[PDB]
Design a protein around this ligand. Structure first.
Ligand code: NAD
Ligand code: NAD
Ligand code: NAD
Ligand code: NAD
Ligand code: TCL
Ligand code: TCL
Ligand code: TCL
Ligand code: TCL
Ligand code: GLC
Ligand code: GLC
Ligand code: GLC
Ligand code: GLC
Lengths: 258, 258, 258, 258
């Protein structure tokens, strides 16, 4: 496959519906060697089993709210992969009260702080902690959404955190390019995942998107996985600092409705 | 003038070089009644005297890091202006260590937190506190920079913070529009101010911009003031959620240096 | 008013609903001296009567499909205005067969040629013909639509031509800036005009926009007129090469229909 | 390879430096069956040789200035490929006088007409003539440049033609999606080709981009070829109507090395 010879670290696998699970299956199909992280001890056994099905035994705990957890994880990874070729950042969060109802009434100083810290700062916190372990030709990838570029009802402060994340992709690509590292994002269309159930009226989003999207269907974790595999491979060597829309054309149309 | 009958609150005046100083003078010239805030006691003297030159005696303390400070300021303002027509948010900050050299090496979890809290959350924190005091026809305005959109050397985490602020403008305009309030920003070109001196090699950015901007000069606080007066008047009733470039055309050209 | 001392030429007045009529009214209210053009003799009478109400007796025929007609019109304008301060370009056309049904089936080579010649090339053709009659501080303005940025049903080849016009605004601002000229556009929301009746199902666009636009109403020729007067005045001296959205925020939101 | 089982038509091979040459070599490596077009009889011999080296003997004349030439080509293709899976459009032209010096002085009505007809209309002319020959899952691709988005010295009216082409990509994707066809573009960074050598001072554009691009090199036809192969394969099933930047990050940075 087109990822033979690469070693990639994958975050955010919580279940078989996760975008990260889809990305991991596609990368394994194309020949990558993989390593996995897990947020807390309730996820340990599920992730160890997923990793074994994909030929890996490298499974390490990591909570991105804590600098010490990130550092400890990369020091343990270093025992088996002293050098490696990049990582997939598939992590997002905001307190549940932030994501329902009018935006100005729901947002709070603490909710804004947590959303930006876990969904945007954590991407660069990981790069800082593994910078000297990355080979030339490495690639980093994160996942964003259209709520960074447009106001969407109920998405609320997560749209501000994703806008900071997309800027993070550009500043990171500009800083690390000279040493041979690329950094990009995929802006995915709506997909039913565990976290998806926390967005007020996510079921109407899905139905609507299917009706007015140019390809006339919502995208899958297999479509997102194949694009993620391409963006972390040497086939995408000419692409850096980019946000790639993997939403079936939804954002480039208007008023398809009638 | 075109602001006759309007009452507008202006934050951020720190010297006569300040962008907020040029916005206040243009708003006074067009007939508005004004009110001013000051960050701390070191700036109190100067702001009281500037307010007086523009015929105002409403000058109140406000540090937007604190929810209590914002609430107290608006309760005092409510004694003389029970209802009013909007405000100008001209406030930004990040720790000095964040703005020099490689972005991945300089950024820290706490530097990111402060930059986003003061430069982006504070705009929506003021709106929450005064929402029921705004008349039909009101307008809110904030100030952004091209670093939100492109990676610029040394601007570093302030670029991410400005990206979060421009998304804030979109989400606020969508939430407040139905009750009759508009929300926009000006993306200003580089101007020599007190805060500008904190950006490593600011003087070089300024020199480069003068030579390649289409109008062949950098913009002034008078240019920004006149556009701010327009965006807070009824003349701009058809504009909301927009980021307007007031940089002489710098962002729309490439390779004029050749 | 803020246009006192300026001489501006206005094209495109067809009737009292025209966007150009709202622009002329707003500039007359702000003190400008005006001059007008008319496409054919069937409009001659009306335009002479519209000009007379606004204090003008400068009414000249001009068909922008022909280089000779533009040159003759500016040579006649030169007898009373050898020097002037800019013009408003409010002209668009595509053959009727282009604007109904599937885009790929409807577009033709000649259909495409005419739409781009009249809606985009004519703006720069008028600039070439009066470049040495413009005073320092002059401003040019044109009108665009969201169809340049997004695929909209039935707008079809006009969307490609507006995309070409918006690039034209950037290339003209970059070339003419150094001698003292600014060039910009307004991207207006849908408004009921004579030309508007040529778009298949225009009445549905109108009602849809009214319900999901942040300000909850469609924009008027007075809203567009006031923004146009600002953009051709010295108040907007810091703005060039820009496309300003005057659509009540419609373009920055998504999925507002609940 | 990932294009096994697909049949793709390739336009635009002029020499071994051509972007379409790199695209052909990469699609052949990934298992596609190919067919080629040549503009006129001065190119026939060399394109026949290049095709033979990639195992193809399907080589047909096509000048996209003429509807009859495009129709005859698709009728001849139909004798060996009744159905096929998409095409690559790598074609552009404007008269040489258009690309030298100040844009407003150089552009003419005829120059503008030819630029838009050959660089933008031709993409949709080809789609109209082969629409009933495309299998479900087909993909169409064109090549654009940052001149569409920003004003660049000397590129002049080509920048307006590329803005029209990018809008053409959106309108094509929206019309053809429901029947199973995707349409995208690659916005490539500068590459030394025969056509590139017609732009005044191309040597300087190339050197400047090399120094300030985040990856600190200019892109190759192999980089572009690999991204083109992915975009015409089922690996990119979730992407349509998109303009993918393959310029090493050049467009997302500003003021590097200053
Ligand atoms: N599902 C969609 O429609 C969609 C669309 C666009 C983007 N996204 C984004 O894609 C990413 C993946 O989300 P998903 O939809 O796969 O949901 P998911 O619930 O399957 O995955 C979210 C993951 O975030 C991880 N996470 C949260 N906080 C963490 C912390 N402090 N430390 C370490 N890990 C933490 C969780 O463990 C979980 O595995 C997110 O960034 C999300 O915003 C989702
Ligand atoms: N100067 C430029 O070139 C430029 C260009 C684009 C945008 N901007 C932006 O314009 C705005 C104004 O900056 P300026 O250039 O006029 O500089 P300035 O130093 O004159 O003003 C900065 C203002 O921020 C205020 N401030 C900081 N922290 C605060 C806090 N916790 N509470 C209350 N007030 C606080 C200071 O008191 C000061 O009045 C900022 O948002 C800045 O990012 C400046
Ligand atoms: N009405 C809308 O919703 C809307 C929204 C956005 C942009 N626009 C644009 O605004 C401009 C003004 O249109 P309007 O809506 O006021 O319509 P209108 O029908 O009132 O005006 C169109 C004008 O085009 C002029 N025109 C056409 N061909 C010409 C030629 N060859 N030479 C000289 N003049 C010619 C006509 O004479 C007429 O005055 C157009 O560019 C249109 O695309 C309209
Ligand atoms: N080289 C670059 O830096 C660059 C960067 C971005 C985009 N592009 C674009 O890539 C495409 C390919 O150009 P290239 O750089 O590989 O140059 P090239 O000179 O190798 O190829 C140009 C091709 O255009 C074809 N062509 C011109 N007029 C035609 C007509 N009437 N009918 C049929 N074919 C015609 C020629 O035959 C030639 O094969 C163009 O669309 C160009 O604008 C090139
Ligand atoms: O970003 C998302 C976008 C969509 Cl459409 C659906 C789910 C998303 O992902 C999240 C949303 C909210 C929270 Cl609390 C956590 C995550 Cl991971
Ligand atoms: O955003 C700015 C952009 C420019 Cl070009 C110049 C000054 C700016 O303003 C700031 C920059 C840094 C800090 Cl710490 C605080 C502020 Cl107010
Ligand atoms: O561009 C427009 C956009 C809208 Cl929403 C409504 C009217 C428009 O203006 C035109 C539309 C079609 C033709 Cl043939 C001529 C013109 Cl002036
Ligand atoms: O579009 C291009 C962009 C670049 Cl940077 C280099 C080459 C390009 O290709 C062309 C340039 C001018 C003309 Cl007349 C025709 C073509 Cl094909
Ligand atoms: O500990 C409670 C919460 O804190 C956050 O830092 C984690 O990102 C989140 O996933 C968890 O629900
Ligand atoms: O003369 C017929 C047509 O020609 C076009 O050039 C004009 O723009 C249009 O208004 C008229 O209908
Ligand atoms: O104490 C340091 C700082 O904290 C504040 O929140 C900032 O806005 C800055 O102006 C102040 O100096
Ligand atoms: O013959 C002059 C020109 O006409 C064509 O339409 C072009 O595309 C170009 O390559 C040819 O040189």
């Amino acid at each position: 496959g087109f990822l033979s010879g690469k070693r990639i670290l994958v975050t955010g696998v919580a279940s078989k519906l996760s975008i990260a699970y889809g990305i991991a299956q596609a990368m394994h199909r194309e020949g990558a060697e993989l390593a996995f992280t897990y947020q807390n001890d309730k996820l340990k056994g599920r992730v160890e089993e997923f990793a074994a099905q994909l030929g890996s035994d490298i499974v390490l705990q990591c909570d991105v709210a804590e600098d010490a957890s990130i550092d400890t994880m990369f020091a343990e990874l270093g025992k088996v992969w002293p050098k490696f070729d990049g990582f997939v950042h598939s992590i997002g969060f905001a307190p549940g009260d932030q994501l329902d109802g009018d935006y100005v009434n729901a947002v709070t100083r603490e909710g804004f702080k947590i959303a930006h810290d876990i969904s945007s700062y954590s991407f660069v916190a990981m790069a800082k902690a593994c910078r000297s372990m990355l080979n030339p030709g490495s690639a980093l990838l994160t996942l964003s959404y259209l709520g960074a570029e447009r106001a969407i009802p109920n998405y609320n402060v997560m749209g501000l955190a994703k806008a900071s994340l997309e800027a993070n992709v550009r500043y990171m690509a500009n800083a690390m390019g000279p040493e041979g590292v690329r950094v990009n994002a995929i802006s995915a269309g709506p997909i039913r995942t565990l976290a998806a159930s926390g967005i007020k009226d996510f079921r109407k989003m899905l139905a609507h998107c299917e009706a007015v999207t140019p390809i006339r269907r919502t995208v899958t974790i297999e479509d997102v996985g194949n694009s993620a595999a391409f963006l972390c491979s040497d086939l995408s060597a000419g692409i850096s600092g980019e946000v790639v829309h993997v939403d079936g054309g939804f954002s480039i149309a208007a008023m398809n409705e009638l």
